[PDB]
Design a protein around this ligand. Structure first.
Ligand code: HEC
Lengths: 104, 827
């Protein structure tokens, strides 16, 4: 989706718990840098729940389409607490900006 | 004619007219005719029996609702407990009512009418009183369970269990297949109340100042006002078009304003439900809504991302105060015990105390107390005022802090368990007790100036969103993501049996009989003998994982200290361990014999090591990482990884017979037909592919569900495929030529489900016709147009490594709560 609205949804609902930038530190939420192509919960330095590590999917626009929709649904038992992004446009946008920054 | 004389009023809607009185007239008749009440009530009851039947009612009739609601009453005023006990104690009556009505009303009726009931009756009535209160979340909301089976989970002393067991025993040679619980007598502690009036999660819940009514807010975008005692539905008011962030009661409780995502604060009346005043100023969301605890004046503390602290005045149409500072968002803004002050608490590390009347700056505190050992940053979750009205109780990072406003520094410090970060904190004015939400749905009760463990709260469906105290000093309320508000007792929860089990339970096999081996929370393990209360507690260093050996006599467990520790059941003083593969060890398995340890970790190498020998043999797969393995009916070792590479190894020598890659990404375990080693499959989390070992690639591919695949099952003598999915759906597919034929939909068209969507291992029936599956609960399927049973249920959500007896009768399982579950099949 839109990149900069993605950076908005990032600075709002993401950036406080996450780092998508290159060489970002781990936090309450994990470092998201290099998200696409990397399996769920594979980033060192952050302690994942087994729910996320056993998910083992490959993060992408569609995987985040389903996940960000209801993050408790897609990866049940995740210590991520969120009520889900119901809007699709928000998902596509945010994911797009992720595709920008995490690649950078 | 009575309408004409104006003694009675008539409302016209639908075909049937609706008659009712006016109050004064009612009280009048109450006074005029007194002695004749009994006559009347017994009259209408007698009539009712003479026409209809108690358990026979048509919901399609026009009189049903009234009967269901007030029949109990009409019996009560008749002072006849015999027909009363006859009606109420009946289970089917309960079933029908609950299905149509829901528990709350009925509960209320018990609580009220308990008086006329006899002394012995009080016990039974009580048993129900807790029964329904505990079952509140499950009942009345369909898909719907059996009454009997739920009654089987009750303590034997409870009349409910005795009646349920009675009827259970009565139905025989019935596809009902009832179950019995020996274990629940010592576990599943009682609760004061359990109430869910919600289709969605709870953001906040709290008791009124008078302790009467409850107004709850959540993702349902609807403020729910209901009774706090029996949980009857009072009023349902729409707060906003968007999710309500926070809500709280006022001084007189008569006014409740809501804040939401739409950035508009709307004042709602509790006894009306109509708009009173509305205030739109903030260009950002408002996370702070707090009212006054006194009748002196009325103010509202608000803050947002605009870095402004705005204090609203409920008397005027505008905002009273505006304050600079707080460069970051303010999480918790709360009034002091006096309205003359205002407390601002944010996670940026700035804790400020402002003058309300003077509007100037009183005190500003930055906490460097927490040591990071890259500027110092200390986040602040919540702020709770002490009963003294001076000290401030807060929780930061991994510890609890008690601040003094006089010294402005650190007055006191309370330790929190391990390294876990504190999610939430609250303090009780009585007994100086304080509850803390820490990690994994754990609400821990600690005492001030103690630093000793007081109480622990378990039995939740999910990690507690938040908890509060009922300021009667008696009890407290709990609210979680399980969408249910609960009432818990302080002194009752304080007692703990320490039955906690973390990630695992271990089954033991003695001939046909099954024995229980549990991994203890505190130190090492607890041994539970079958069909008896014999418990042998074994204490050692902490363990990461435990595994039982074939032929027994031994045990092999991995620790958090690394590698693998092997210990002998005969002598605990004798143990063997070797240091290899620094990464966390996951799966540990012996060969067909008691020798040749096979172990793996996260790495490109799998270790095969011989003990009493000390033979070191390393098997390299030359990949990014390796997940796990399993032993087949042969000496071959079937292993899988995150790279989707399925390998077949051998003992004592590294060998690769074939390489099977179904898809890209993590592949979950392996699925065999169990009829032979020929047919073999696995879950690639995309499609379902099976190979006969006739090629290096899977021969047959099944695309039936491409969204998610959690697991798959091949039933013996059938080979028909049962597909478990991430959604927790179990689909039945006929397999002959390796293609899709039949079709079934496990999901319900009744709409979204609350708890469920998890499956791990599937089990088979001894007949082969019946099927055993987990849809988040215990659910039995069947081949050829329809299933076996939806019976009973599984408390909680997450399940780990389902195991069963080889006779397929007695069962052993555990929930996410870590509670031992034992099933016994007896006719
Ligand atoms: C209040 C908590 C919270 C919020 C809000 C939150 N996260 Fe999460 N998130 C977490 C935690 C904790 C994890 C780690 C899950 C685990 O370790 O099991 C996580 C996991 C993730 C992952 C998976 C990383 C991986 O490698 O699998 C992604 C992606 C992510 N978050 C992005 C987001 C996005 C996008 C949003 C909002 C639009 C968001 N987070 C909001 C707490 C949060």
């Amino acid at each position: 989706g839109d990149v900069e609205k993605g950076k908005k949804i990032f600075v709002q609902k993401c950036a406080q718990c996450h780092t998508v930038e290159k060489g970002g530190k781990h936090k309450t939420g994990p470092n998201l840098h290099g998200l696409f192509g990397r399996k769920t919960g594979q980033a060192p330095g952050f302690s994942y729940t087994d729910a996320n590590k056993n998910k083992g999917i490959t993060w992408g626009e569609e995987t985040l389409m389903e996940y960000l929709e209801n993050p408790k649904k897609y990866i049940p038992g995740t210590k991520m607490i969120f009520a889900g992004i119901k809007k699709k446009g928000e998902r596509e946008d945010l994911i797009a900006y992720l595709k920008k920054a995490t690649n950078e | 004619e009575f309408v004409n004389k104006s003694l009675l009023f008539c409302d016209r809607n639908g075909k049937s007219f609706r008659y009712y009185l006016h109050d004064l007239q009612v009280d009048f008749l109450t006074e005029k005719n007194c002695s004749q009440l009994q006559d009347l009530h017994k009259k209408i009851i007698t009539q009712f029996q003479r026409y209809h039947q108690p358990h026979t009612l048509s919901p399609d009739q026009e009189d049903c609702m009234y009967w269901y609601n007030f029949l109990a009453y009409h019996m009560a005023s008749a002072k006849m407990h015999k027909e009363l006990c006859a009606l109420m104690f009946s289970l089917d009556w309960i079933k029908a009512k609950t299905e149509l009505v829901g528990p709350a009303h009925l509960i209320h009726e018990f609580v009220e009418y308990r008086h006329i009931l006899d002394e012995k009756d009080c016990a039974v009535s009580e048993n129900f009183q807790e029964f329904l209160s505990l079952n509140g979340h499950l009942l009345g909301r369909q898909p719907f369970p059996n009454i009997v089976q739920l009654g089987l989970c009750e303590p034997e002393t409870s009349e409910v269990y005795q009646q349920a067991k009675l009827q259970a025993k009565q139905e025989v040679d019935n596809g009902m297949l009832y179950l019995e619980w020996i274990n629940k007598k010592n576990i599943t502690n009682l609760s004061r109340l359990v109430v869910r009036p919600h289709t969605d999660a709870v953001y906040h819940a709290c008791f009124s100042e008078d302790g009467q009514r409850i107004a709850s807010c959540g993702a349902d975008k609807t403020l729910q006002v209901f009774k706090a005692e029996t949980g009857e539905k009072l009023l349902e008011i729409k707060a906003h078009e968007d999710e309500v962030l926070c809500c709280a009661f006022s001084t007189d409780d008569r006014f409740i304003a809501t804040c939401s995502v739409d950035k508009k604060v709307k004042i709602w009346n509790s006894m009306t439900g109509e708009l009173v005043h509305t205030y739109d100023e903030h260009s950002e969301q408002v996370n702070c809504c707090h009212f006054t605890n006194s009748s002196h004046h009325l103010l509202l503390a608000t803050g947002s991302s605009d870095c402004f602290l705005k204090l609203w005045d409920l008397n005027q149409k505008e905002c009273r105060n505006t304050m600079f500072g707080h460069t970051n968002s303010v999480n918790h803004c709360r009034f002091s015990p006096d309205d003359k002050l205002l407390a601002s608490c944010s996670a940026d590390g700035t804790l400020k105390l402002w003058d309300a009347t003077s509007a100037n700056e009183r005190k500003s505190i930055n906490v460097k107390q927490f040591f990071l050992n890259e500027d110092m940053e200390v986040i602040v979750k919540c702020c709770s005022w002490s009963a003294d009205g001076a000290r401030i109780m807060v929780a930061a990072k991994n510890k609890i802090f008690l601040f003094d406003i006089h010294t402005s520094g650190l007055l006191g410090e309370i330790h929190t368990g391990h390294h876990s970060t504190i999610q939430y904190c609250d303090f009780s004015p009585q007994n100086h007790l304080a509850v803390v939400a820490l990690s994994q749905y754990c609400v821990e009760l600690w005492n001030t100036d103690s630093r000793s463990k007081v109480a622990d709260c378990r039995g939740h469906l999910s990690w507690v969103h938040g908890v509060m105290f009922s300021p009667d000093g008696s009890s407290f309320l709990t609210s979680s993501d399980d969408q249910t508000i609960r009432l818990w007792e302080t002194k009752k929860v304080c007692k703990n049996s320490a039955v906690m089990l973390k990630q695992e339970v271990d089954v033991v096999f003695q001939e046909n009989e099954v024995m229980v081996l549990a991994v203890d929370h505190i130190r090492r393990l607890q041994l539970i003998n079958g069909r008896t209360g014999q418990i042998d507690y074994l204490t050692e260093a902490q363990v990461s994982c435990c595994c039982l050996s074939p032929h027994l006599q031994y045990i092999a467990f991995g620790d958090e200290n690394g590698a693998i520790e092997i210990l002998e059941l005969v002598n605990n003083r004798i143990f063997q361990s070797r240091f290899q593969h620094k990464k966390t060890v996951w799966h540990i398995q012996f060969t067909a014999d008691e020798k040749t340890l096979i172990s793996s970790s996260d790495d490109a190498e799998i270790q095969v090591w011989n003990w009493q020998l000390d033979k070191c043999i390393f098997l390299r797969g030359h990949q990014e990482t390796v997940k796990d393995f399993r032993l087949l009916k042969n000496s071959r070792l079937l292993s899988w990884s995150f790279d989707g590479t399925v390998k077949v190894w051998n003992i004592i020598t590294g060998n690769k017979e074939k390489d099977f890659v179904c898809h890209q990404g993590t592949v979950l375990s392996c699925d065999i037909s169990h009829d032979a080693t020929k047919f073999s499959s696995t879950s690639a989390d995309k499609t379902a592919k099976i190979w006969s070992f006739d090629l290096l690639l899977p021969l047959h591919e099944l695309r039936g569900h491409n969204g998610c695949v959690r697991c798959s099952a091949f039933s013996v003598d059938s080979t028909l495929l049962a597909t478990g999915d991430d959604n927790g759906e179990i689909r039945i597919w006929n397999v002959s030529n390796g293609e899709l034929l039949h079709l079934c939909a496990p999901l319900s068209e009744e709409g979204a489900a609350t708890h469920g969507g998890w499956v791990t291992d599937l089990c088979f029936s001894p007949d082969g016709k019946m099927l055993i599956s987990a849809g988040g609960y215990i659910k039995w399927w069947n081949v050829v147009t329809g299933e076996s049973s939806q019976t009973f249920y599984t408390n909680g959500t997450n399940l780990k490594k389902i195991h069963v007896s080889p006779d397929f009768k007695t069962y052993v399982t555990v929930d996410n709560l870590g509670i031992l579950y034992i099933l016994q099949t007896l006719e």
